[PDB]
Amino acid sequence: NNGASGADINNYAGQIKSAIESKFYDASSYAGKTCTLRIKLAPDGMLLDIKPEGGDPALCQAALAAAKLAKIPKPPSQAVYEVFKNAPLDFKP
Amino acid sequence: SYNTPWGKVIINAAGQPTMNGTVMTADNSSMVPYGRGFTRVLNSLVNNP
């Protein structure tokens, strides 16, 4: 069933995190803080819609600015794109 | 498969995001504020609701 979908999904999430993070001017100013972002991606990783859903307002703010710029990799699977056409993500510098 | 105050976003086939039947790219598309977040539209950034 969900055979091996779980691992890829966790993986892909962590790859979104690192793409957003790579676009920070000062990613160390936010080191312990947490932000929850709700993301919608196209079939090829292109940003469609982004909104925050919990956590630090300052971090949430910078993390949306960085999300505008990130190059997000292409979903490697139907199951993964199924999840990340709409999904919440904990972002932690 | 969705819509914003500026319109409806549909996923085409061959998997391109379209709006008004337009396959929006990184080039005719920008990210515009929407409440506490952003959302992508194309050439209608100033279109009142």
- C-alpha torsion angle, residues B25, A22, B34, B2 (rounded to 10): 50
Q: Domain of residue B12: give its range.
A: 1-49
- Per the entry, the structure determination technique was X-ray
CA distances from A62 to A44, A52, A56, B8, B42 (A): 24, 11, 10, 28, 23
Resolution (in Å) of the shown entry? 2.7
**Measured distance CA(B5)–CA(A57) in Å, rounded:** 24
For residue B28, how many other CB atoms are within 10 A of its CB?
A: 12
A50 touches chain B (CB under 8 A): yes
> What does the alpha-carbon distance between residue A12 and residue A53 come to, in Å, rounded to a whole number?
20
Find chain A residues with C-beta within 8 A of B40's C-beta: 47-49
Report whether A48 contacts B39 (CB < 8 A).
yes
CA atoms within 13 A on the CB side of A39: 29
Q: Yes or no: say if A61 and A5 are a contact pair by the CB < 8 Å rule.
A: no
Domains present along chain A, CATH in parentheses: 1-93 (3.30.1150.10)
Report the domain count for chain B.
Answer: 1
CATH number at residue B46: 2.30.30.970
H or E stretch covering A54 = strand A47-55
For residue A55, the surrounding DSSP H or E stretch is strand A47-55
Distance CA A70, CA A17 (A): 10
At what angle are helices A57-67 and A5-21 packed, to 10 degrees?
Answer: 90
- Number of residue pairs across A and B with CB atoms under 8 Å? 43
Dist. CA B20–CA B11, nearest whole Å:
11
